[model samples]
Target: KPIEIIGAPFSKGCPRGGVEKGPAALRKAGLVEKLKETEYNVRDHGDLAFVDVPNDSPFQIVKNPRSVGKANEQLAAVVAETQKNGTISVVLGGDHSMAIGSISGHARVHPDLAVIWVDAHTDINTPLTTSSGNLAGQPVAFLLKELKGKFPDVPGFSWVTPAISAKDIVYIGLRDVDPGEHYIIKTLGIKYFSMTEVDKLGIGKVMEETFSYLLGRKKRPIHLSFDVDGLDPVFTPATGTPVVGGLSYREGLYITEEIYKTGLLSGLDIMEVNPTLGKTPEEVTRTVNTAVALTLSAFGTKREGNHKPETDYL
Candidate 1:
């Protein structure tokens, strides 16, 4: 089956200025060609043009609420269409906020969808809890149907119904969590592993525990919403949020490879790669290359001895 690649070049979800260039940066780095070399079927949907952020705000606490919602509505529709055609979706993100749309679209098709959120932050701040008022920090709040009534009515968000539950999502590589986010996680009983757990249990064991907890005996379709900042600042410094002491380069790739072996991965978002944030061209290239490599790993690329030959191998 071909994987549908949808580029989302939006940045209004947060106050950051450079994240809007993420999709273009990945494309210019030849992401599509690189995937084709792995012999997987690929469909390039090109990049979604950026929309201007309107001055209007339906909610005082959520910055750029209308603009972000509009962008996500467009993203959700594209993701849903790709899923309906029986293809995995690879969404190149403008920011981590795009997860709202990508995950929503996946949930539309598979009501029982499980999400693996790889990031340093929980991103679950509600309108009343957010200190910065950034919409990117509030995506999870909107995606949970239980919290719908707590949010103000935004014009473009009418199309978005809550598609995922807190229990169905798991988080890995969390370290820099807001107090509000922490409260939400504790209150909702969402499964998450911080760097402390990762250090003690190892990523392999952590993943095993995660799968046991979420999938049990049956495997559900998985949507991997990965934020580049989940990796150590050394590995991916060209992101909007660079947290120290994060996932190692190998650990990041390991997560993707393990998920690929599951054969249950339905969608992926390699997000929050900000090309302009890098101090030098070399730094930007390193980050982009790492992002491309991670994407490749998710779609079955691996070392020679790590993977077994398929039955039809010549």
Candidate 2:
């Protein structure tokens, strides 16, 4: 299948300034060309400009609600359009909040879709619950129709009806969840594997169980919403909201590789790679290369010594 790439260079969802440069950094790191090397038809749709919206708040808990909603609304439309054409969409993001659009876009087409969210934070806080007031922390809340009346009306979000159920999403690599987010996860019975689980079960078995719980005997379209902070800071330090003791580089790549092997992945979001967060050129290069490597691994790229034997080749 062809891969449709969309660059969402928006960052108002969080307080951070440099995450908007994520897409450009990835491109400069040769993201498109690397995907092409994977032999998938790669369509680079280019980056979306940062859309600014009025931030006059009727409520103080949810910051930049209008701007985040407006930008994601635009992204949802583009993603939905790309999905309708029978291509897999790969979104390079400015922040984790972009999942509000990317997932919504996928769910609109396959209403029974499931999500695999890999992040260090649960990000399930509703407008009423977010102490930080960042809209990035609340995308999962708005994406669930169950929380519809629980949130205040944000200007551009009226168009986004909840497209996912709590039962349809699973989280991995979480370790820095807020108190409110913790409450939501437990109350909703969302399946999640923190680093503790990763420590106990290993990434391979964690994935095995995740797939069993979510997919069961049926095949479902999957939207992989990956936040770069899911990786250990040693592997990806250039993202906003980095938490220590997260997934290792190989563990992170293993998640993507296993998901790609399922053949059910319909879309992916590579998010939270903030280029300016790095202190030096080498640091930026390290982060960008990690992001690109993860992406290529998801698309079936193999490293040296990982190739199948010639006898197994088709």
Candidate 3:
């Protein structure tokens, strides 16, 4: 399959404004070209231009609902386009909340989609349970079928329906979880491997268990939603929500490399690479470059090295 790069510069999901520049930073660092190091044909879809939704104030505890929801609509349709065309939809993030669109769009094509969420926070907080009211932390609530009919209706999210069963999605690299999110995860038993497990089991075994759980019963399209903050701050200090004790650089790349080997990756969202948070350009470059590196690994750039087909020598 080909790879389609869709930039999502819409950042209403979180309070931070500079997160909208994530796509530009990734592209400026050679996103399309490096990805071509793999065998897939990479198509640069460019960034999505989002329009403001007026009077789109917070609906109760939810912030930027109208704007965020509309942006979801935009990215969702675009992802569906790429997925239906037999391309891996590589959605660049404005914020992690964009997964609502990317995953939904993917589900529209492959209803049996399995989600691997790589993030520091589960982002499963419901509107009523949110402290910051940032939609970035609440995208999982909108997508889980187990959470349906439990939370109040949000203003901007009417178009989004619960698309995945609680078992369909798995959370990785979690160190932060709100009270409500933990409660729901406990009650629903949503499969998650937090830092505790990641430390004890190691990234390799983590992927091993992940494969057994997701691929054991059957095979399906895998949607990987990777948040930059999932990596240790040393690698991704430019993200808005930085939690310590996260995945290391090698650990992060190894996860992607293993996922790529699965050969069932249907969609990917590399998110939350906010260039504005770092103190210097060097720090920002490190984060952007790490994000690119993780993405390339997912596309089959092995550390052991890769080679073009011998036919290319002709």
Candidate 4:
């Protein structure tokens, strides 16, 4: 399948400015060129047309109801279209809330898709339970089938359907989970590996068990929703939500490298790379470069290095 690079330059889900420029920052840092080096037939779909929603009032504790809802609806449609045409959609984020669309869209085609949510937080707060009310923190609640009726309808969200089963979702690198999200994870019995688990089992073994748990039944399409905040703040410091104890650079890339080996990755999201939050230009560059590296690994670039299939040295 060709790799479709869909730029989702949206950030209304959180109260931040430059998150909306993530796609451009990533591109300026040469994402498309590096992807070609990794040997993928990559196509830049350009940025999606996500305009602001007029009179987009808040719903309960949720902020920017109309903008977030509308943006995700468009994303869902775009994602499904890409998958239907035999492409692996790589949706770059405006915020993690974009998962509501990417997962929803992929599920439209491959209904049996499972998700690997790589983040510092579980991101599963219901509207009423969320103290911050940012949709970026609540996308998981919106996508799970088990929580179908858990939340009330918000504007521009009627089109959303509960997509994946709770058991089909696995969370990695979690450290800052909220009470509501923790309760939901336990109640639904979702699979997760917090920083403690990663420390105890190691990234290699944690990934081993991840595949065993998720592939126990049959191989299903994978939606890898990777939030850069899952990495230690020392590494991915420019993201909106950074936690101290998170995956190291090695553990982080290992997760994607292993997933690439599975050959089941259908939808990929590189979320929360807000360069403006960086304290220095070097910091911003580091974060953007980190995003590119993650993308490359996910698309089959291995640290073991590479060589073309049949060149002769005569």
Q: Give the Cα lDDT of each candidate.
A: 0.87, 0.88, 0.91, 0.91
Model 3 spans with C-alpha error above 4 angstroms: 311-314
Off by over 4 Å in 1: 305-314
In terms of lDDT, model 1 sits at 0.87
- lDDT (10s digit) by residue, model 3, range 203-275: 8899999989988999999999999999999999999999999999999999999999999999999999888
Best-to-worst order by TM-score is 4, 3, 2, 1
Candidate 4 ranges with C-alpha deviation above 4 Å: none
Clashing residue pairs in candidate 1, if any? Answer: none
Ranking by lDDT: 3, 4, 2, 1
Which whole-number lDDT from 0 to 100 does residue 51 have in model 1? 73
**Model 2 C-alpha lDDT per residue in residues 267-308, reported as the tens digit of each score:** 999999999998788878888988999899888876543454
What C-alpha lDDT, on a 0 to 100 scale, does residue 233 get in candidate 1?
90
How well is each residue in 129-180 modelled by candidate 4, as lDDT tens digits?
Answer: 7999899999998998898888788888999999988999999999999998
Winning model by TM-score: 4
The positional error of residue 47 in candidate 1, measured at the CA in angstroms, is 0.6
Give the lowest summed-lDDT range of ten residues in model 3: 305-314
